[PDB]
Design a binder for this molecule. Structure first.
Ligand SMILES: Nc1ncnc2c1ncn2[C@@H]1O[C@H](COP(=O)(O)OP(=O)(O)O)[C@@H](O)[C@H]1O
Lengths: 57, 396, 243, 396, 41
């Protein structure tokens, strides 16, 4: 039981992760769009793909 | 006594930037590990700079090893999968597995756990590498186990360091050629003498060095005329040693900075063979410092050094390596060993190989190889091998 | 402070953690250091430490910036007197610590790099095989320099400094003699590693560093390999004897 | 005619970023100075780039000078104290005093005041350097007083410039050896001639240069064989001058860029002695430009230059210095002066020193010093000095 | 061995040691005299 200097108790809103609200919405919408057109489920295998070759293909 | 700044602020503004998300995720990771393992994990590294055991984690997951268990994903809409495939590596790995970034893994028996927490900054996706353990003793035992695991992994690989302008670049290679000691074609008396040191160093109990009080390092130099197959011989010996093998390629970018880098990296794999490809290419201005890292007052142990040179005097005037062995070109006995090994018996009766060993006096191993391709091509093309005809064509 | 906490020394006491959900422990282990230290102790970052006897306290306060995790190094004292005495006590503390590590300066591209190591094979004086009179005279000048107290260099206004040069056919005990001195004196030993990056900027850094370690031994192996365009400067740096 | 952007905004959004804090602090600093001194200070520099009088402020506070008064702290929970101790300086200063950052100081008589306003950006603590004055005339008189204060401070120091790869590095040194003119061991006729110029330049009324219309600069060169103690002689002469002394160390990094930097810095201390340690080490490609900064069409005044060379022709073919004086090795008269000064009379009767001066023909000052240590050590060790024995041992 | 090694450096005596100890440990012989020749060679 060692004291803590910082004793501010955080609101539920302060826990939001910057930029995740947009990104997660987009990813979810892309998933739904791909399902609506093909009736199969797609998921993310790369968030920001460093590979260029098949992107240039 | 006065204070210029007299604004007093509401306590909602004492809140620390970023801490609300981060502390919330750490709390949840701890809660989730408790939910799954009934123990309390504690944060030991907030953004771990160490790479070694993080790369063991990735290889452990990549390779379907049982030892690390996937515990949780961090964000629901970030990646749950990933693949090894990087287009910048020589050997492509197409394995698909659960993501590392956006996941929590635990080694439950070891009592340590890993989390790569994604975050957005400057419009790239980065991560905090977070490391947890159940207590100090397990944390320490985990750390002490890292280098031993690295050592076994590297027994199965050859590590090549190539000096560049930024520094040395480390590439790992799979051992596709297993070399047994019987395939090391070489003067059998020096083969015996050199393997005396090799076997003590790598393949025996290490108490010898304590008993006779002998430094646990060795460095030998293989020299001779060009074309006598020195580099091919060293790679043969290196491949027969049950220990990680490292190759160091001197380039025009070799400095005292790349020297220290490579020796430190090889030493992390100790005991290990360090092969020095053609020590001749070393710039003159680093040669003095190089030998001082072999035998100076602060030189370290753990390495069996093997170098090759065509100009022995240019490197080490005198001896700051331990022994220098001359490789000549092969006598009739060695020639025959080579021709049986290289595959001449495919198209040659036993007598024809005995005869061809006789007729190839003054041939280098290289030239015996260039002879192999020629007689093989004629044999494949025509069904005839004219060994007799082709040794002469090669002489003149 | 870190070394005191790492070594389980008594004199710094852990006072508190700053944030409840940042690290409470850490370990020394740096895969970039030549010697691997696997000690696990309380965190430096995210903790408050105090030297109660000395009236000085340390807080490494974490904060979040540009993604990465950083920290302010806050220093506290009880009064100005106690703060000054603490600072005045640092050089002697570091001198004692350096008696038992070996300090190596290696000239790199930017400038010199300093690492503290332990020696891989200690060489006792008795294992240094040598003409006993040559041996006694070399060990005696070193022992007399640091431990016979220097009424001499003071009464006659002669700089308190000495240099000897070891030379001969290789493999006969120069390095061995040097290694034997590290163990056997009560003063720090430092090695200067000359490289192709050795420059006048680098000679300045080593002697400012070495002299902060004084009284000490500065060993310069292979002094012949010092580049020509800095030999002049190096002589001028030795004659900077006042410092 | 149309406008693409048609949003019209509430006036709370015309607010200027950062200005609310900053203007509030400036208002408070002005109010607090009024409260304490009954006058109105005005901002003259928002983030002052000038370093010179800020470093006088710090030295004034460090040294407990009465002239700057602590007026206020800016933030209640930032530092109220600080110390000079920086581990990167040669000479450590352990003085503890009131903080500079987070404080307001005033020179009340001068009517100017300083504030280092802390602020957080990029997770380091920085400051705006803010400068106030009661009116334009006091602001100007303060600025005009800066170089004169710098000049007195530097009389008490030796400033060494060492050329490096980025540029020249300036280090100040305390004068621990005071040198009087009687300790300058030297040929007494050139001692007389050179001090003729020195005393006019530094130790007299400067009207002479106006009367005879003579440029207020001089540069002399001291040359001769090696070992005749040239550098020790120049430091002796430099230390007898009542003016700031600067040393310039030519290195392998000396360029036309470091030349201009050092001359500009020495000139800020004008009149000053600039000692050029071994002008021989100067790269050939800057030698032409160097002399053009001595005597070219845009060359400036205020410096007494003193250089030393063993190869006079390599530097200045011909003369672009004003005079060159040859330093030989000392005759019997000078030798005796040295031996009395150096401390030989500690263990030598008056006759023995007269005799030893006689026997040391062809000795350099250096060798007379190497003789001093030897006879002193024997005298300390044994109680015997064998001057007679040791001059011979030194000859052969 | 001390007379057979006239002109040897200490470092070469140390390599003579390591080589002898190896042969002693692994084979029960030492071959001190063969080795002195092998090293002058
Ligand atoms: N005088 C000596 N006493 C003991 N061992 C020695 C001596 N000289 C050489 N050696 C052995 O040979 C090795 C190389 O010697 P070293 O001291 O590096 O010689 P140098 O530096 O003069 O070339 C040492 O590590 C030591 O094992």
């Amino acid at each position: 039981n060692i004291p803590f200097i910082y004793q501010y108790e955080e609101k539920e809103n302060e826990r939001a992760a910057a930029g995740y609200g947009t990104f997660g919405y987009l990813i979810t919408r892309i998933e739904e769009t791909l399902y609506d057109q093909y009736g199969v489920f797609y998921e993310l295998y790369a968030s920001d793909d460093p590979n260029t070759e098949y992107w240039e293909l | 006594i006065p204070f210029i700044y007299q604004y007093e602020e509401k306590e909602n503004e004492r809140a620390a930037a970023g801490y609300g998300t981060f502390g919330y995720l750490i709390t949840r990771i701890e809660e989730t590990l408790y939910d799954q393992y009934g123990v309390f994990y504690e944060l030991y590294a907030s953004d771990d700079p160490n790479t070694e055991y993080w790369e063991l984690l990735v290889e452990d997951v990549r390779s379907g090893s049982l030892e690390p268990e996937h515990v949780a994903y961090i964000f629901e809409k970030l990646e749950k999968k990933t693949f090894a495939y990087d287009e910048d590596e020589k050997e492509p790995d197409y394995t698909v597995h659960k993501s590392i970034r956006n996941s929590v893994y635990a080694y439950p028996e070891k009592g340590v756990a890993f989390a790569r927490i994604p975050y957005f900054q400057d419009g790239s996706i980065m991560s905090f590498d977070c490391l947890f353990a159940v207590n100090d003793e397990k944390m320490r035992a985990f750390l002490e186990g890292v280098r031993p695991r690295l050592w076994e992994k590297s027994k199965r690989k050859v590590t090549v360091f190539t000096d560049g302008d930024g520094g040395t670049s480390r590439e790992q290679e799979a051992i596709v050629r297993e070399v047994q000691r019987s395939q090391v074609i070489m003067n059998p008396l020096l083969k015996k003498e050199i393997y005396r040191s090799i076997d003590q160093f790598f393949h025996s109990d290490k108490s010898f060095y304590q008993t006779y009080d002998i430094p646990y390092k060795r460095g030998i130099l293989l020299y001779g005329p060009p074309g006598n197959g020195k580099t091919t011989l060293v790679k043969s010996i290196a491949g027969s040693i049950d220990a990680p093998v490292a190759y160091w390629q001197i380039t025009e970018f070799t400095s005292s900075e790349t020297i220290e880098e490579v020796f430190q990296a090889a030493r992390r794999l100790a005991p290990a063979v360090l092969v020095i490809e053609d020590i001749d290419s070393m710039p003159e201005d680093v040669r003095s410092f190089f030998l001082n890292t072999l035998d100076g007052a602060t030189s370290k142990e753990g390495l069996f050094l093997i170098g090759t040179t065509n100009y022995p005097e240019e490197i080490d005037p005198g001896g700051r390596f331990d022994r220098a062995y001359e490789i000549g070109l092969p006598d009739e006995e060695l020639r025959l060993e080579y021709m049986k090994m290289r595959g001449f018996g495919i198209f040659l009766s036993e007598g024809e190989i005995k005869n061809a060993a006789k007729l190839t006096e003054g041939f280098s191993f290289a030239q015996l190889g260039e002879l192999y391709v020629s007689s093989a091509l004629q044999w494949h093309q025509e069904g005839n091998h004219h060994i007799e005809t082709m040794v002469k064509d090669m002489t003149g």
